């Protein structure tokens, strides 16, 4: 339905069909009181090839929350499998300290492999940071 982000209320927007490459939308609050959104597409060059998650949708947004020093955000995606078992261990490491993130899978996600999850989670960052490649 709707998820809480500051004073605003954001619902699930429209997302392209799942063709094998995941797409996602990220919402956050600018330093004015407003709402801003950005699109993300899986794959592409990354500065951290040693981390598996750093090329996925729910971790490029995490790194974007660290480059600009943002606190709260919200991401969507369109994969009928959920979050893999790699991101649920590495998103906290990639996230800066005391940073909160929520990832909302599409409705009807049925995990199949080991470690996959099909429910919304809350991620809290820790003090550690990524190792240089």
């Amino acid at each position: 339905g709707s998820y809480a982000l500051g004073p605003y209320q954001i619902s699930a927007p429209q997302l392209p069909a799942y063709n094998g490459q995941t797409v996602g939308t990220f919402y956050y609050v600018n330093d004015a009181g407003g709402l801003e959104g950005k699109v993300f597409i899986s794959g592409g060059p990354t500065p951290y090839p040693n981390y598996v998650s750093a090329g996925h949708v729910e971790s490029q947004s995490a790194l974007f929350m660290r480059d600009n020093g943002i606190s709260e955000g919200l991401v969507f995606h369109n994969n009928p499998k959920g979050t893999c078992g790699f991101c649920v261990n590495m998103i906290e490491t990639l996230l800066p300290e005391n940073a909160k993130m929520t990832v909302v899978p599409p409705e009807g996600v049925i995990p199949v492999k080991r470690g996959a999850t099909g429910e919304t989670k809350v991620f809290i960052g820790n003090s550690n940071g990524p190792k240089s490649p």
Binding site: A17, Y18, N19, G20, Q21
Partner: protein, 638 residues
């Protein structure tokens, strides 16, 4: 009485008794000219030649300045050796001028492989062949005249080229290709008479007739496919393509009769599929392989293991009989003494000339594993290609020199020594490392990477010749050139890039980076030419941006992907309901031919019987292999 001269017992037995005295007569002069004893022994099948080389050798050097001893011996050990040399002394003076302008190597090749008759025929008719109405390149004349049976193919070509090329209708080059092989006169005479009968009654294209008539042993395959085709097609159930494939090798007549006589016995008693029989019989010496399989299948599959699939794998390739007979004897010794797993022996023996590789491995394993520090796995890897014996001897000779003079680790030498033609790559690296490492500026690792692929010698020579022009007249960087030349067939990719970069950049709006990306894969030249041909049609008849075409072509096998897309876009888009974006997503993640045909063949039953939307099957086939993920897992488990 030859012991006093310096000949051993083994060399003495080779020389026939009735010629022994002659060898004693001309020994002093022959050794005085710089001939080794083995050369004298070799130049004894033609005794009269021992009287020529000794008597006149200064004139041979004068007329042929670059000739060596080995070439002279090879020319003089044939059926007409003395006469060929004496004719060369009187003909080479005129043959070096117009209109042919031949060199020493071509003269020695034509003499050795054709005789005095061939050299005199070339000398006599050097004006009518080059002139109208023939217009033959000198290389084509040399190729025709360099086979046993010359002076007959040239006359037959001079008589039949216009008639064949006008009435029936053939390209000039096809007649030369037919006449190049041995016994080309009979092949030309037979094809001229039998082309209409095969092309009208039996429904065969002229290209197939040319393909099966361009092998040594013709006039017999053509006369056999004119009689055995209907019986095989109707009684046994083989398509004409399989018959043509069987009959398109040396000794195809024997293969056809053996298949006709042995198909039911193998298909009923030993339990083999017809496709396996055709695969075994579709090579040179097919009948020997078929008979050896029929004899050795029960024994090799009950006392040694070796499931029938492995036996069929060994039975293929040229000389399968020798490989089977060598495996049946050397399996226990190699498995019990040196400690080699049977699948390693099977892998070694499943190549051309596997008998030599097995014998060389057995002889050379202890020395390589106890005097140079190499694991048995590395030796197995070296001897699992075509020509493994030469690679093993070359690496044994050249390991310390490369490891000390140039500072190369043994792993790099092992990597180079593998592949096909590893020996040539090793010698080329040894010769060309200092030249490339100080003048052009390349690092040793880049040279090793270039040489660690099939045809490394050609890539190294082409790089040494083409680096400055590509790096100065076109703006390319040396790293991009190394990337292009790294893969197999680097010479063709580099030449095609040099020839086609300006045209694609100026007439099709493609940046140099896209051209480099296309031509940096296996078979890059085919992708480049296919892109040049198919870009305007695929961007006008159907909506397709150039970036999508580049993405399709920037993969291993992009030519097949482009052709399949151009052929299957309308039917898939209209009769099944898929956006072109989904088609170009399927045809851009490797493969690109199996995946599209698999989707077309499996869409209805998978969408209806199981209940998956076309989006799900498109997603499954998009990322990954596609064919193995659709045929199994989804369409088999469910």
């Amino acid at each position: 009485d030859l012991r006093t001269l310096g000949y051993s017992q083994q060399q003495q037995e080779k020389i026939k008794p009735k010629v022994r005295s002659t060898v004693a007569q001309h020994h002093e002069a022959l050794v005085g000219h710089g001939f080794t004893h083995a050369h004298i022994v070799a130049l004894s099948q033609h005794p009269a030649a021992l009287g020529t080389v000794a008597v006149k050798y200064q004139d041979m050097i004068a007329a042929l300045p670059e000739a060596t001893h080995e070439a002279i011996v090879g020319v003089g050990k044939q059926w007409s050796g003395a006469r060929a040399l004496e004719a060369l002394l009187t003909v080479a003076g005129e043959l070096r001028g117009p209109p042919l302008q031949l060199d020493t190597g071509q003269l020695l090749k034509i003499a050795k492989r054709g005789g005095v008759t061939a050299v005199e025929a070339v000398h006599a008719w050097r004006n009518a062949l080059t002139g109208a109405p023939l217009n033959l390149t000198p290389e084509q004349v040399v190729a025709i005249a360099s086979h046993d049976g010359g002076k007959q193919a040239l006359e037959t070509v001079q008589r039949l080229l216009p008639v064949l090329c006008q009435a029936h209708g053939l390209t000039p080059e096809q007649v030369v290709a037919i006449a190049s092989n041995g016994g080309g006169k009979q092949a030309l005479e037979t094809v001229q008479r039998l082309l209409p009968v095969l092309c009208q009654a039996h429904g065969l294209t002229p290209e197939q007739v040319v393909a099966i008539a361009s092998n040594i042993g013709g006039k017999q395959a053509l006369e056999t496919v004119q009689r055995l085709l209907p019986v095989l097609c109707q009684a046994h159930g083989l398509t004409p393509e399989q018959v043509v494939a069987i009959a398109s090798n040396n000794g195809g007549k024997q293969a056809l009769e053996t298949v006709q006589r042995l198909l039911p016995v193998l298909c009923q008693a030993h339990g083999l599929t017809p496709e396996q029989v055709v695969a075994i019989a579709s090579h040179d010496g097919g009948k020997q392989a078929l008979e050896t399989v029929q004899r050795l299948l029960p024994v090799l599959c009950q006392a040694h293991g070796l499931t029938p699939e492995q036996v069929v794998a060994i039975a293929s390739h040229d000389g399968g009989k020798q490989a089977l007979e060598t495996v049946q004897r050397l399996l226990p010794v190699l498995c019990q003494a040196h400690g080699l797993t049977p699948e390693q022996v099977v892998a070694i023996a499943s190549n051309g000339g596997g008998k030599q590789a097995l014998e060389t491995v057995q002889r050379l394993l202890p020395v390589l594993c106890q005097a140079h520090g190499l694991t048995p796995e590395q030796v197995v890897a070296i001897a699992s290609n075509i020509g493994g014996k030469q690679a093993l001897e070359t690496v044994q000779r050249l390991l310390p020199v490369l490891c000390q003079a140039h500072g190369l680790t043994p792993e790099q030498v092992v990597a180079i020594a593998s592949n096909n033609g590893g020996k040539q790559a090793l010698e080329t690296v040894q010769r060309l490392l200092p030249v490339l490492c100080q003048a052009h500026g390349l690092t040793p690792e880049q040279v090793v990477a270039i040489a660690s692929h099939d045809g490394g010698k050609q890539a190294l020579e082409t790089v040494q010749r083409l680096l400055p022009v590509l790096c100065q007249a076109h703006g390319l960087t040396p790293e991009q050139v190394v990337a292009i030349a790294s893969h197999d067939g680097g010479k063709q990719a580099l030449e095609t890039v040099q020839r086609l970069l300006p045209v694609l950049c100026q007439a099709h709006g493609l940046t140099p980076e896209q051209v480099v990306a296309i031509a940096s894969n296996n078979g890059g030249k085919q992708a480049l030419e296919t892109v040049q041909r198919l870009l305007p049609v695929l961007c006008q008849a159907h909506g397709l941006t150039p970036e999508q075409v580049v993405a399709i072509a920037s993969n291993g096998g992009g030519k097949q992907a482009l052709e399949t897309v151009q052929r299957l876009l309308p039917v898939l888009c209209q009769a099944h309901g898929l956006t072109p974006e989904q088609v170009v997503a399927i045809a851009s993640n490797g493969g690109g031919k199996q995946a599209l045909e698999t989707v077309q063949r499996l869409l209805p039953v998978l969408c209806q019987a199981h209940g998956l939307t076309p989006e799900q099957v498109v997603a499954i086939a998009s990322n990954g292999g596609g064919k193995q993920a659709l045929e199994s897992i989804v369409a088999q488990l469910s």
